Design a protein around this ligand. Structure first.
Ligand code: NAG
Ligand code: 2HA
Ligand code: CL
Ligand code: CL
Ligand code: CU
Length: 228
């Protein structure tokens, strides 16, 4: 359980969608982060992978604001403290807005994977995962926006999948957090995109999995990494 509380770009903080404060207001502020209804700080499980909730979390609506990123620039997402028990991959996707991200129909977004990290070491099962790397970085993740993609407005969909209950059907816990970016630079690629509702299925080999046994490999879920 947790959420993204802050985003660092170009030497400043963009405040996140503080899901334990803003939902409790009739007049919340404008941010780059999407609003959600996930006030339990929880997850979308396999029962929701083909509902709109998987796209940018439960009841999500676009952020009003969009943050500019320098060409090949970094986006640092700062989480609430991630529990060590919640072992799993950290995955990052972009989808183009083809206009202002604030007015997009989330159900039409087509995501391409720009980064993935999974099982890092398995010397002592359940081992050390991308989520443990995030904890070791003081609950921060660094995303480099590719230089080879077409610039424009994009949704960044940044996600932890916790696997501590993933040996039973619909036990994996997805934690997607979306923010609006203005990608800048000289790139041209328009990568093949996947609908949010086709990213994951509740029987995928990296989703329905017992992490407590020795693993020889881990197949990171979702469509193939874009490498440009
Ligand atoms: C994170 O930073 C704090 C100090 O602000 C430090 O005490 C702590 O050990 C750091 N955590 C890790 C895992 O490096
Ligand atoms: O999430 C869990 C308890 O915190 C296990 O399913
Ligand atoms: Cl609730
Ligand atoms: Cl922690
Ligand atoms: Cu949790």
């Amino acid at each position: 359980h947790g959420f993204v509380q802050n985003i660092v770009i170009d030497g400043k903080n963009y405040g996140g969608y503080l899901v334990n404060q803003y939902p409790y207001m009739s007049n919340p502020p404008e941010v780059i982060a999407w609003s959600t209804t996930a006030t339990d700080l929880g997850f979308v499980d396999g029962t929701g992978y083909q509902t709109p909730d998987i796209i940018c979390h439960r009841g999500a609506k676009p952020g009003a604001l969009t943050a500019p990123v320098s060409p090949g620039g970094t986006v640092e997402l700062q989480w609430t403290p991630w529990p060590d028990s919640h072992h799993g991959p950290v995955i990052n996707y972009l989808a183009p807005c083809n206009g202002d991200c604030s007015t997009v129909d989330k159900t039409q977004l087509e995501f391409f994977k720009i980064a993935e990290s999974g099982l890092i070491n398995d010397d002592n099962p359940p081992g050390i995962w991308a989520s443990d790397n995030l904890i070791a970085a003081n609950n921060s993740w660094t995303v480099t926006i590719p230089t080879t993609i077409a610039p424009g407005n994009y949704v960044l969909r940044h996600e932890i999948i916790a696997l501590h209950s993933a040996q039973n059907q619909d036990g994996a816990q997805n934690y997607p957090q979306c923010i609006n970016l203005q990608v800048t630079g000289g790139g041209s690629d328009n990568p093949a995109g996947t609908l949010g509702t086709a990213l994951y299925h509740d029987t995928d080999p990296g989703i329905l999995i017992n992490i407590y046994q020795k693993l020889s490999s881990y197949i990171i879920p979702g469509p193939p990494l874009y490498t440009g």
